Amino acid sequence: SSAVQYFQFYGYLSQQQNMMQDYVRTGTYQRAILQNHTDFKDKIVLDVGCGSGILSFFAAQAGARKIYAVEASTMAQHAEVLVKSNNLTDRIVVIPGKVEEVSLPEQVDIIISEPMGYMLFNERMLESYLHAKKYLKPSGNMFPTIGDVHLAPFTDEQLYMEQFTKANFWYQPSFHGVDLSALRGAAVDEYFRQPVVDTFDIRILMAKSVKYTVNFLEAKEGDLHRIEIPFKFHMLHSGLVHGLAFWFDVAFIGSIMTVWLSTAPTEPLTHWYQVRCLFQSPLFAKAGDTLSGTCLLIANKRQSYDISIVAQVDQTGSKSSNLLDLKNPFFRYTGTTPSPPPGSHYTSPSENM
Amino acid sequence: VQYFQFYGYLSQQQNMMQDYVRTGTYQRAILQNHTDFKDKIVLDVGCGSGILSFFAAQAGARKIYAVEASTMAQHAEVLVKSNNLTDRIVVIPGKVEEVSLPEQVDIIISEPMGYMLFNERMLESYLHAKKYLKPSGNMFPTIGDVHLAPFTDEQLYMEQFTKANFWYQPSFHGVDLSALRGAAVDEYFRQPVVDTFDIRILMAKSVKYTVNFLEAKEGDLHRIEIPFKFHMLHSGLVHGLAFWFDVAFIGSIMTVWLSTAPTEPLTHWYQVRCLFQSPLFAKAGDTLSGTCLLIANKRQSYDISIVAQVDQTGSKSSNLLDLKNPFFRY
Amino acid sequence: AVQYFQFYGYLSQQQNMMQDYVRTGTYQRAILQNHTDFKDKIVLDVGCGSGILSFFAAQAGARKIYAVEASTMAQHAEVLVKSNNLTDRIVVIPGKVEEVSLPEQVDIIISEPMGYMLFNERMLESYLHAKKYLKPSGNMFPTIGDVHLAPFTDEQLYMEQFTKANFWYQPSFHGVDLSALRGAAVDEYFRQPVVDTFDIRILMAKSVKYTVNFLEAKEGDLHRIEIPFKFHMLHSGLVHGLAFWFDVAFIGSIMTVWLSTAPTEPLTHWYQVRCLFQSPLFAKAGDTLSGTCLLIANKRQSYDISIVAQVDQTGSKSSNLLDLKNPFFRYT
Amino acid sequence: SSAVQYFQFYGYLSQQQNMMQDYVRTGTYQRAILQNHTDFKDKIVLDVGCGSGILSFFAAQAGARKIYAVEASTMAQHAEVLVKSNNLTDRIVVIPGKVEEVSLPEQVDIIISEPMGYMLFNERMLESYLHAKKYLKPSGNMFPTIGDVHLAPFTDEQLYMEQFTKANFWYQPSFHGVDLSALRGAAVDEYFRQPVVDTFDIRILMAKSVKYTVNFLEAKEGDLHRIEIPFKFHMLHSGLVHGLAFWFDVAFIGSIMTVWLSTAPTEPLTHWYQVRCLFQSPLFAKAGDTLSGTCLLIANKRQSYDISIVAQVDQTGSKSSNLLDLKNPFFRYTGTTPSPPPGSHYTSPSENM
Ligand SMILES: Nc1ncnc2c1ncn2[C@@H]1O[C@H](CN(CCCl)CC[C@H](N)C(=O)O)[C@@H](O)[C@H]1O
Ligand SMILES: Nc1ncnc2c1ncn2[C@@H]1O[C@H](CN(CCCl)CC[C@H](N)C(=O)O)[C@@H](O)[C@H]1O
Ligand SMILES: Nc1ncnc2c1ncn2[C@@H]1O[C@H](CN(CCCl)CC[C@H](N)C(=O)O)[C@@H](O)[C@H]1O
Ligand SMILES: Nc1ncnc2c1ncn2[C@@H]1O[C@H](CSCC[C@H](N)C(=O)O)[C@@H](O)[C@H]1O
């Protein structure tokens, strides 16, 4: 259905290029695969969504005997050219098609893949990554092995006001002689259903994070159809909570060492950035209060999730419920350094010049 | 399809409404020609928010049929009710090709122009809607002029060549990508560059291609052939062709023009530039002749072929372009 | 070989080198400050040109100076010696220092044999060959040479050369397809050393050094020169190639004097030299750039250069050929 | 010899590019071949020193049946690659070697070449071009067909002084304590033996040019070993004559039309520019005087000419005799517009602004 558009997007070389040029990502995968050469040398490997084939080449540098590289986009055509020109035709096998519908010659010793999306789960490629375990030997391994999602409440007044400023275009009685007021509410609802793709200063976060772990060795493809993330935040600061901030970490658990790829706002940026879900009604909280609630991710037919966030301040009973659409996020990043919150100065800035 | 979902968002209707030149030229063109709307029947093909039907209602139209296929039709009918015009503006959800109208109309109004005028292939629906048009009916816009002109922009050319050279690395993290160097260059230079530019970079007076919406058939736009013969005013490197367009509202009281030229204030259409993989050298006085051929595709766009040659020297350049994968250089 | 000595046979070239104030004044100061290494001694000037260095030796008190010059500049040199009244101290001997015979062994050899990257022109071999005339505790001015290498980032230069090479990427230059030769064009242009100066900001790691000791080295060492390097990257960026320059030291009895062609120092007719990678290498600060620069002597009195550079963390490798015989003089 | 250094120079693609990028040169050759297609249509052609092969390609565009493209530098290898990739292997035969020492299968109907150097004659490739006539049918044609060398007396005080300024470096009694004066005369002599490659404003010319024609259809290889150019100038202006200026034209005399390629200072610049030979003793002449003399080019073993220029003003008998070496010219061009001589203002500049 919408799979056509998805595989059209990853068929352009310029997109593969954007992902390969993310040094954090490609470098961490290369480090993780080569530093665990005992997990690869002369073993069988499966690259789920090989794209250019970069990960299979990394697997080859580690000494794999044979690597099955599955690719469903037309990038399979270009991928085979790199294997022939890198004289690895005898160890890398390009298979055009989807990992679900293809046939593999044999069970593999280890599976490698880069299936993470915004908030880890977006794009629903982890389901294909776990589906691939039907080709995995009883003692096989998976790179990445586990993925951790993180959540924290945030305060950002300017991000929050921005939505009503954009929507208030509709609240004028004579836009070229037409009254648009009747659509203001609908415009507001639309903008708040967009998760914001951006970075931020860590000082806007108001409580230590909370983590939902997906163990790719134990999880089933069905575990990813309904993801329920409960949270109970102890506020470090007492502000207005305009929503929740999401990021993720993944770990490659190999024989020699475990390697981490992290997209935290404390780490170097990546092409995943961070994702923020705004509350249409911000929640006020004291410091020490508990912000309790649930984040419910419900898979949809269009390769994404419907996000439901219900949060409440237990001491005051103040409740906020929000719905978001992760397939239509708002890309807000600019490149500017992130300005810090006001009221973050505990000593005179003038006496520090 | 993805197309009608995109235009189902209020934020997109807003982005196009906040284009002041576009909206104000449409309103002024309609209002100053209120005689072509007084007590008449109107069809608005793709009304979106309904802004154009409201312009028609302001001009005195007795009844306006507003066809919209995206979910925007629901919101459009909310503005009709809250503006107390429900007896004059009739929203009809669906595609103009599929809906049934109660009667024939005196005039069709629409905003079907895309990049290079032809993008999005909504002109075909604007023309197809003429099956509901009375024998002497009129159309806003009446005609569309596509303008093309050769340009020189060294920075843009090296900008794209730089990105294509990523695929020339013999050892990117130990991997040889050079085998794909050729596909990378094809793909990048197959990107129309959507942006504005200063008129300084044009090396010849523009050439014009006219589409008359009153006389044209939906089939004409399946394959559009634009021949060009440029007379070069300056010497140097021709890195490609630049496209922009004008449309004219030919009404009873006056004709009003809407332009996306680089000398005029900016629109959400900007201008479009097609790059040659290898620029062409030309002197002042030379002639640059060739053909730009647009063949419609199933993905709501066109496959573009540009054949150009310097007649004096025989230097030839052939380029195919994908209007489906633009490069917004904003 | 004939073309080499015709070139240095023109008085205008000798002028171009003599008008290099840093060069000529540093040689005089190094010679005169160490006058005890010259007083009442025998001297050999290898490739005297106009004679300038022999005149510095006579100024320092040398009893007799043998000035060897193989171009026709030897005859002009003889004229300056007569008109400067030094016929009893400076003896011009025409011919190559490899082929002439000298009346006695010398206490010190002086020369100016450095070329681009120090080794260009392959005159250091003749400077070292002349050591057969050197007494057991003799000295040599210059005494040691330090070649310096450092990676650099310079986008405009890289695209400047790529623009030139891309002329051969045309499908119809006057109706003729040249694209079949784009690969040969890029190979040729990027084989060209870029002779120019540059601001030290473009360097991304502290320079690495390769030292030649003229007192100890033998003429054979310079037929194949292997230069290892291991750079610790200080900035994150694209490495577009390596930059080369050199210092030489006059290690005299009284003091050591240094002559430098570094980009932080005033300009010399040697400028600096850069080798471009066809495909730049990406490196982050903290990474290590390791590799080898290899100079293989050839018949045209120059070197075939092979530069292999590698980012140790990422495995990005780059191998480049360079022909010192076809440099690109970019200075204007 | 110098042949080695000569053919090494033309093996670099950057050099061929420099010559191909001279639009005047390459464009005029293309026009001259294509507009005379009757001289090429289904005929046998010989391209002497093809370099990239460009001229052969032009002759193929005009319809020639077979072209023999002779090249002595290693550019011959790259020339064959262009012929294969342009699908012309059945009509263009690249022959590596020197035109004097190679063999052709057959006689040709027409010979094409670009053998002109500074002052037309420099580098001595016209001799190879004329030598190639051993392969020409009794009524064959040659492109170019005739060459015109133009001479004219000029006045340029700043160019003239520039030489003494450069040589007077040697006229100091203490250059780091060394008296250099003895070499001043030798230094002056050296600089004046350099012809100057540059362009100039035609107003520095003091008499109508004189021309010496070589007819390539009739000239013999030995004619070019000793070239005697008598001149007799009628001075249009009174002044100091600092030397003579040289340029050249070639004409392609085809069946349909004659096409001219000119390096005159009145025409668009080319990579040949113009060449000026300075007199060490300038000659004074007033308008109406006659400047008579001879310009004698004596071929030498290093692929160039020794030039002797003797001029005298007949009215005064004032003589000047100068020797120049064409193999060590001074390339003076910059790109600055040539400033016009003083005082060429016959009307007040202030009354014109
Ligand atoms: N069902 C599927 N079967 C096979 N491949 C798929 C499938 N779904 C998505 N992919 C493939 O995975 C590639 C993208 N993917 C990262 C997206 Cl965040 C891996 C890129 C590359 N191998 C890297 O790791 O850097 C894309 O080419 C896509 O087509
Ligand atoms: N094998 C040789 N034997 C004798 N002379 C040689 C030899 N090789 C080169 N030379 C001569 O020494 C001169 C080299 N020259 C600059 C080198 Cl970049 C030094 C000029 C002179 N000492 C100054 O600094 O002013 C040239 O004149 C050359 O002819
Ligand atoms: N005796 C010879 N035999 C064969 N080749 C020769 C001979 N003498 C000179 N050449 C060759 O002709 C080429 C020079 N020629 C320009 C001279 Cl200013 C090339 C122009 C070329 N046809 C263009 O227009 O691009 C050089 O490549 C040279 O190697
Ligand atoms: N065949 C078709 N039938 C009906 N509506 C169509 C259509 N093709 C496109 N549309 C709709 O027409 C609109 C194009 S832009 C609408 C802008 C509006 N006329 C204004 O001036 O503000 C979109 O809402 C699109 O979804």
Side-chain angles (χ1 to χ4, degrees):
Chain A
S1 52
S2 172
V4 181
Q5 181 68 58
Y6 177 82
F7 293 123
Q8 279 175 199
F9 176 81
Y10 285 112
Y12 292 100
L13 290 158
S14 58
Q15 264 301 321
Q16 300 291 336
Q17 180 178 345
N18 279 349
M19 293 187 301
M20 296 167 75
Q21 293 193 211
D22 185 336
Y23 182 78
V24 177
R25 189 205 76 132
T26 305
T28 306
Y29 263 83
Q30 185 190 34
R31 293 164 68 179
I33 292 170
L34 296 193
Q35 282 162 4
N36 293 322
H37 45 270
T38 59
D39 289 310
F40 290 93
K41 193 187 175 178
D42 200 12
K43 298 196 190 296
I44 303 302
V45 186
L46 169 59
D47 183 352
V48 188
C50 61
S52 63
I54 182 72
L55 303 184
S56 299
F57 295 115
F58 293 165
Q61 290 172 8
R65 186 184 78 189
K66 191 188 291 176
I67 302 145
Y68 294 102
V70 182
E71 179 58 45
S73 72
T74 57
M75 191 57 52
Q77 301 301 318
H78 303 311
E80 182 164 329
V81 172
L82 297 181
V83 174
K84 293 175 176 173
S85 60
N86 280 266
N87 298 315
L88 291 164
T89 191
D90 67 311
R91 286 199 294 165
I92 301 171
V93 179
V94 178
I95 301 174
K98 307 169 196 188
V99 68
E100 289 88 4
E101 315 178 2
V102 294
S103 57
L104 267 61
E106 57 179 339
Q107 305 294 283
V108 310
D109 304 288
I110 183 165
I111 299 175
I112 63 182
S113 191
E114 192 261 79
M116 301 86 71
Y118 295 138
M119 294 169 75
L120 179 67
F121 300 111
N122 188 47
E123 298 169 47
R124 297 181 55 190
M125 185 171 163
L126 294 164
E127 291 163 47
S128 309
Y129 181 50
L130 292 173
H131 178 93
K133 283 195 295 187
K134 70 181 178 178
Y135 303 113
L136 189 63
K137 292 176 179 178
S139 61
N141 200 2
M142 300 195 88
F143 277 19
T145 311
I146 70 100
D148 291 335
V149 181
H150 282 260
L151 297 93
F154 75 88
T155 180
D156 189 337
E157 201 73 36
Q158 275 178 333
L159 178 65
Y160 181 89
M161 282 181 297
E162 186 172 291
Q163 313 301 315
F164 287 95
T165 301
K166 288 192 299 187
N168 277 344
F169 162 84
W170 296 95
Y171 196 60
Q172 43 194 328
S174 183
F175 173 82
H176 294 266
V178 183
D179 188 347
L180 309 173
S181 319
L183 294 174
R184 195 271 200 162
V188 175
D189 294 346
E190 180 184 296
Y191 287 117
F192 274 94
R193 291 164 64 85
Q194 290 193 279
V196 175
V197 182
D198 206 346
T199 189
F200 51 82
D201 184 338
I202 59 181
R203 281 177 284 190
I204 74 171
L205 302 175
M206 301 160 72
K208 181 183 176 293
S209 72
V210 164
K211 63 189 186 184
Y212 184 80
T213 302
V214 178
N215 191 334
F216 305 148
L217 289 173
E218 305 170 1
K220 310 293 189 162
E221 186 175 351
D223 304 349
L224 299 183
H225 291 149
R226 176 191 179 276
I227 311 168
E228 191 187 3
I229 309 171
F231 57 85
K232 176 181 183 299
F233 295 118
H234 291 284
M235 311 300 295
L236 309 175
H237 317 101
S238 296
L240 290 168
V241 182
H242 297 278
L244 300 184
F246 295 75
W247 65 90
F248 67 90
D249 297 353
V250 295
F252 306 84
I253 303 170
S255 298
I256 302 173
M257 69 192 80
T258 291
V259 171
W260 284 95
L261 169 58
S262 183
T263 71
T266 58
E267 284 289 314
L269 207 63
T270 70
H271 76 275
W272 288 291
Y273 305 91
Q274 288 88 46
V275 180
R276 295 139 88 184
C277 300
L278 284 166
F279 299 158
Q280 222 190 109
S281 291
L283 290 173
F284 179 84
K286 65 194 168 186
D289 247 350
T290 52
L291 188 72
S292 298
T294 204
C295 177
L296 185 73
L297 305 172
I298 296 170
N300 54 35
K301 60 184 289 180
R302 305 182 179 177
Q303 187 161 5
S304 196
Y305 289 80
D306 305 314
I307 310 174
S308 178
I309 299 171
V310 175
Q312 195 180 354
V313 181
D314 294 331
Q315 281 69 8
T316 67
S318 304
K319 188 192 80 179
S320 181
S321 300
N322 313 268
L323 278 170
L324 293 91
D325 294 342
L326 186 48
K327 178 55 168 169
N328 186 39
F330 174 59
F331 190 80
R332 187 170 179 258
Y333 185 70
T334 53
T336 58
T337 297
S339 290
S344 296
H345 293 300
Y346 308 128
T347 57
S348 171
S350 288
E351 273 168 344
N352 300 325
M353 300 158 68
Chain B
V1 190
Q2 199 72 52
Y3 177 81
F4 290 119
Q5 279 173 3
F6 179 85
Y7 289 111
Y9 290 101
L10 291 160
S11 54
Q12 262 306 316
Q13 299 291 331
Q14 179 177 356
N15 178 72
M16 295 187 299
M17 291 165 82
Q18 298 200 271
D19 188 338
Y20 183 70
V21 180
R22 185 197 78 107
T23 306
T25 310
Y26 263 100
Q27 184 185 33
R28 187 93 159 167
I30 287 170
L31 291 191
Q32 275 169 169
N33 290 329
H34 56 267
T35 56
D36 283 309
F37 294 90
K38 183 199 172 178
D39 301 322
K40 302 195 190 301
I41 308 301
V42 186
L43 169 60
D44 179 358
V45 186
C47 66
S49 56
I51 192 76
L52 305 181
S53 302
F54 289 112
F55 294 161
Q58 288 169 6
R62 187 179 73 195
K63 188 170 286 181
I64 304 144
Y65 294 98
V67 184
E68 176 63 46
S70 71
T71 59
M72 192 56 44
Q74 297 110 40
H75 304 311
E77 180 60 23
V78 172
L79 297 177
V80 175
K81 292 176 175 175
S82 60
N83 277 268
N84 298 315
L85 288 160
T86 188
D87 71 321
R88 289 168 70 192
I89 301 171
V90 179
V91 178
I92 300 175
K95 303 172 198 186
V96 72
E97 290 86 7
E98 308 172 354
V99 299
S100 56
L101 268 61
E103 54 183 337
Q104 307 291 283
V105 310
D106 305 285
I107 179 166
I108 300 175
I109 66 180
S110 183
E111 197 270 69
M113 301 93 63
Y115 293 138
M116 289 172 72
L117 180 68
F118 300 114
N119 188 43
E120 295 178 56
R121 296 189 58 190
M122 186 175 167
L123 297 166
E124 297 157 52
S125 315
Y126 181 48
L127 297 168
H128 175 94
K130 290 183 295 186
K131 66 184 179 175
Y132 303 112
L133 188 62
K134 290 177 179 178
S136 278
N138 197 5
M139 302 194 86
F140 272 25
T142 315
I143 68 164
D145 288 343
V146 188
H147 282 256
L148 39 174
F151 72 89
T152 178
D153 193 336
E154 193 191 5
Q155 187 57 64
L156 174 62
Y157 177 82
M158 282 187 302
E159 185 180 313
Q160 298 295 84
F161 220 85
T162 300
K163 289 184 298 189
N165 269 331
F166 168 90
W167 298 97
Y168 184 57
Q169 286 176 92
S171 183
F172 170 81
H173 292 269
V175 184
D176 187 8
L177 314 175
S178 64
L180 294 173
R181 66 192 182 280
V185 177
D186 290 356
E187 185 182 299
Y188 276 110
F189 285 80
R190 207 188 290 119
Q191 289 192 297
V193 181
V194 184
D195 201 5
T196 188
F197 53 77
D198 189 342
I199 184 171
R200 294 167 294 175
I201 71 169
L202 299 177
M203 298 168 71
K205 185 184 182 298
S206 74
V207 168
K208 183 191 78 178
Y209 181 92
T210 301
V211 179
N212 190 334
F213 300 135
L214 284 175
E215 305 166 1
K217 305 294 191 64
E218 184 179 355
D220 308 349
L221 285 57
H222 298 162
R223 180 179 181 276
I224 311 165
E225 193 178 353
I226 305 173
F228 55 85
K229 182 171 180 295
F230 294 116
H231 297 85
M232 305 300 291
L233 302 175
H234 312 100
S235 302
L237 291 167
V238 181
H239 295 89
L241 298 187
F243 296 82
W244 66 89
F245 67 90
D246 297 14
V247 298
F249 307 88
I250 302 172
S252 298
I253 296 176
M254 65 187 72
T255 290
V256 171
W257 284 86
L258 168 56
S259 181
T260 69
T263 62
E264 288 294 320
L266 207 67
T267 79
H268 76 276
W269 288 291
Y270 304 85
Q271 294 88 40
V272 179
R273 287 185 286 176
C274 303
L275 278 170
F276 301 161
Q277 292 193 10
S278 194
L280 290 174
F281 178 78
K283 280 196 69 178
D286 277 347
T287 53
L288 184 71
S289 291
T291 305
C292 187
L293 182 70
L294 304 171
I295 296 174
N297 61 31
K298 180 55 183 162
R299 301 183 179 174
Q300 285 90 63
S301 196
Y302 290 84
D303 305 317
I304 309 173
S305 51
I306 294 169
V307 184
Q309 66 157 26
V310 181
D311 298 322
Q312 280 66 10
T313 67
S315 303
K316 185 191 77 182
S317 181
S318 299
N319 312 265
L320 277 58
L321 177 61
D322 177 55
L323 200 43
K324 163 67 176 176
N325 186 40
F327 169 48
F328 312 89
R329 210 166 75 121
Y330 298 175
Chain C
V2 171
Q3 199 66 57
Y4 174 84
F5 288 120
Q6 283 167 196
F7 177 95
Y8 286 111
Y10 292 106
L11 291 162
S12 56
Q13 258 300 315
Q14 298 294 329
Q15 182 174 351
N16 177 71
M17 300 185 298
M18 293 167 82
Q19 297 200 277
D20 184 339
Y21 182 66
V22 177
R23 186 198 78 104
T24 305
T26 310
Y27 263 96
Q28 181 178 34
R29 193 82 169 169
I31 289 167
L32 291 189
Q33 296 280 54
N34 293 289
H35 53 270
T36 55
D37 286 326
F38 288 94
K39 192 207 303 170
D40 305 317
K41 302 197 191 311
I42 305 303
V43 186
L44 167 59
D45 176 356
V46 186
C48 64
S50 59
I52 188 73
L53 308 183
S54 303
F55 288 107
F56 296 162
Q59 290 165 4
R63 183 183 77 186
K64 191 162 287 178
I65 301 143
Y66 298 97
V68 182
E69 174 60 45
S71 72
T72 56
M73 193 56 49
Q75 285 94 51
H76 303 310
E78 296 166 357
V79 172
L80 296 179
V81 175
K82 293 178 179 296
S83 58
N84 283 274
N85 301 130
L86 292 168
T87 49
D88 60 318
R89 286 171 72 193
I90 304 172
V91 178
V92 178
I93 299 174
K96 309 174 201 304
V97 73
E98 285 88 4
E99 307 175 349
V100 298
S101 60
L102 265 63
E104 58 184 338
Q105 303 295 281
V106 309
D107 307 290
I108 180 165
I109 300 176
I110 68 180
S111 188
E112 200 262 76
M114 300 89 70
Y116 297 140
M117 288 173 71
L118 182 65
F119 300 115
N120 185 40
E121 294 173 52
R122 296 182 57 188
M123 186 171 165
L124 295 167
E125 295 157 55
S126 314
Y127 181 47
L128 297 170
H129 178 98
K131 297 169 60 172
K132 66 185 179 176
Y133 299 114
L134 188 61
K135 289 179 177 178
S137 279
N139 199 357
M140 299 196 85
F141 273 31
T143 312
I144 67 103
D146 292 341
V147 188
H148 281 254
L149 310 75
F152 72 86
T153 178
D154 191 332
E155 193 190 3
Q156 188 61 68
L157 174 60
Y158 175 82
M159 285 185 306
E160 185 178 311
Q161 296 288 81
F162 222 79
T163 295
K164 292 181 205 164
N166 271 327
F167 165 89
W168 297 98
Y169 192 56
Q170 283 182 88
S172 180
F173 174 81
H174 295 262
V176 187
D177 187 3
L178 314 174
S179 64
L181 294 175
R182 76 164 288 280
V186 175
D187 292 354
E188 182 181 302
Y189 281 105
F190 282 79
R191 222 194 303 271
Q192 287 195 282
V194 180
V195 182
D196 201 355
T197 192
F198 55 78
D199 188 40
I200 185 172
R201 290 175 302 185
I202 73 172
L203 298 178
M204 302 165 71
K206 189 185 179 299
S207 70
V208 163
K209 179 228 297 283
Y210 178 86
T211 300
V212 177
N213 186 334
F214 300 131
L215 280 176
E216 310 303 328
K218 309 302 184 62
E219 182 182 8
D221 300 345
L222 285 64
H223 288 159
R224 178 182 180 276
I225 308 165
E226 195 177 355
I227 301 173
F229 56 85
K230 187 169 180 181
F231 295 111
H232 302 278
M233 304 300 297
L234 304 174
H235 311 103
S236 298
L238 284 171
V239 180
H240 294 94
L242 305 184
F244 293 84
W245 65 91
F246 69 88
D247 296 20
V248 297
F250 309 91
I251 299 173
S253 301
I254 295 172
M255 66 187 75
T256 289
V257 170
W258 283 86
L259 167 61
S260 183
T261 66
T264 59
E265 285 290 316
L267 207 69
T268 72
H269 76 279
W270 287 292
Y271 301 84
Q272 293 92 44
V273 180
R274 282 179 284 174
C275 305
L276 282 166
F277 300 160
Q278 294 193 9
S279 193
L281 289 179
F282 180 75
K284 286 200 69 174
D287 275 348
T288 296
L289 187 72
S290 63
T292 304
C293 183
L294 182 72
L295 308 161
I296 298 172
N298 59 29
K299 146 65 180 157
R300 325 192 195 176
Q301 228 189 349
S302 195
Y303 289 88
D304 309 310
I305 308 185
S306 51
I307 299 168
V308 176
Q310 195 183 11
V311 181
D312 298 320
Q313 279 65 10
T314 70
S316 299
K317 195 180 82 176
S318 183
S319 302
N320 313 270
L321 287 176
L322 188 77
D323 288 354
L324 285 171
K325 204 65 170 179
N326 180 39
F328 164 44
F329 306 113
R330 194 164 171 260
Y331 47 85
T332 49
Chain D
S1 178
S2 172
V4 183
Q5 200 75 47
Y6 176 91
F7 290 118
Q8 281 176 7
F9 179 86
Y10 289 106
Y12 294 106
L13 293 158
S14 62
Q15 272 302 322
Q16 297 292 332
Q17 181 176 346
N18 288 343
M19 295 181 302
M20 297 164 73
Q21 292 193 306
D22 185 330
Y23 186 77
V24 175
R25 189 204 73 122
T26 302
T28 305
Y29 266 85
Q30 187 178 32
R31 281 149 53 201
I33 292 170
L34 272 48
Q35 279 162 209
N36 291 294
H37 52 263
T38 55
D39 292 305
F40 286 93
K41 188 184 294 177
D42 192 12
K43 294 198 188 298
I44 307 302
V45 185
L46 166 61
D47 176 2
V48 180
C50 60
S52 68
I54 179 72
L55 299 183
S56 305
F57 294 112
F58 292 165
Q61 292 171 10
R65 185 187 79 182
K66 187 71 76 67
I67 298 145
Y68 301 99
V70 181
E71 177 60 49
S73 72
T74 56
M75 189 56 51
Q77 286 100 6
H78 305 310
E80 181 66 26
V81 173
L82 292 179
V83 173
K84 289 179 177 172
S85 63
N86 276 263
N87 305 312
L88 289 164
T89 49
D90 63 314
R91 280 148 74 188
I92 300 173
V93 176
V94 182
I95 303 175
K98 304 174 192 188
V99 74
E100 291 87 347
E101 312 169 355
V102 297
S103 57
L104 263 63
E106 57 186 340
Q107 308 295 287
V108 312
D109 301 286
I110 180 166
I111 297 175
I112 64 180
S113 187
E114 198 274 80
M116 302 93 71
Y118 291 140
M119 291 175 71
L120 182 66
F121 294 111
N122 188 45
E123 294 170 51
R124 297 180 56 187
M125 188 179 166
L126 289 166
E127 289 157 47
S128 313
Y129 182 52
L130 294 174
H131 178 90
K133 283 200 294 187
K134 68 182 180 179
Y135 298 120
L136 191 64
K137 292 178 179 177
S139 283
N141 196 357
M142 304 192 85
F143 272 17
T145 310
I146 66 97
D148 296 337
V149 190
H150 287 260
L151 306 78
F154 75 85
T155 186
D156 192 348
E157 197 75 34
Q158 277 177 339
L159 174 65
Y160 179 89
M161 286 184 304
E162 188 179 290
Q163 315 297 323
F164 284 96
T165 298
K166 288 188 298 186
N168 276 342
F169 161 85
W170 294 94
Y171 198 60
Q172 39 193 324
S174 179
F175 174 84
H176 295 261
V178 184
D179 184 358
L180 308 172
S181 315
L183 293 174
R184 198 274 203 159
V188 180
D189 290 354
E190 186 181 299
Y191 284 112
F192 273 95
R193 294 166 63 85
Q194 292 192 111
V196 174
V197 181
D198 205 344
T199 190
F200 50 81
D201 190 313
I202 60 178
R203 282 175 286 189
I204 71 170
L205 299 177
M206 303 165 71
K208 185 182 179 293
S209 81
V210 164
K211 81 170 189 180
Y212 175 90
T213 300
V214 178
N215 189 330
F216 301 133
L217 289 173
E218 306 159 355
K220 324 281 190 159
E221 190 175 356
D223 296 338
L224 306 187
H225 300 160
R226 169 193 180 277
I227 307 165
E228 192 183 2
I229 306 170
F231 57 85
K232 174 176 162 296
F233 296 114
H234 301 289
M235 306 304 293
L236 303 172
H237 312 102
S238 309
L240 280 291
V241 178
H242 301 101
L244 302 181
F246 292 84
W247 67 90
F248 68 89
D249 292 1
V250 294
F252 307 88
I253 303 170
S255 295
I256 298 173
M257 73 183 71
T258 292
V259 171
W260 284 88
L261 169 58
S262 181
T263 73
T266 63
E267 286 294 311
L269 212 62
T270 74
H271 76 281
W272 290 291
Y273 301 96
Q274 291 89 42
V275 184
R276 284 183 278 173
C277 301
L278 286 161
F279 298 165
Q280 218 191 107
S281 295
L283 289 174
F284 183 92
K286 55 189 171 187
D289 283 346
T290 296
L291 184 77
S292 61
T294 215
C295 172
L296 187 70
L297 298 88
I298 300 169
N300 61 43
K301 56 187 289 179
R302 302 180 177 176
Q303 288 209 275
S304 199
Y305 289 85
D306 304 307
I307 305 176
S308 170
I309 299 171
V310 303
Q312 65 166 15
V313 180
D314 296 325
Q315 284 71 8
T316 72
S318 311
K319 194 196 78 176
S320 176
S321 299
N322 313 273
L323 283 169
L324 293 91
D325 283 339
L326 193 45
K327 189 69 175 292
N328 185 40
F330 174 62
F331 192 84
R332 188 168 177 259
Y333 185 73
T334 52
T336 306
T337 294
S339 292
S344 297
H345 290 296
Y346 307 126
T347 58
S348 172
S350 284
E351 238 174 345
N352 299 330
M353 50 182 275

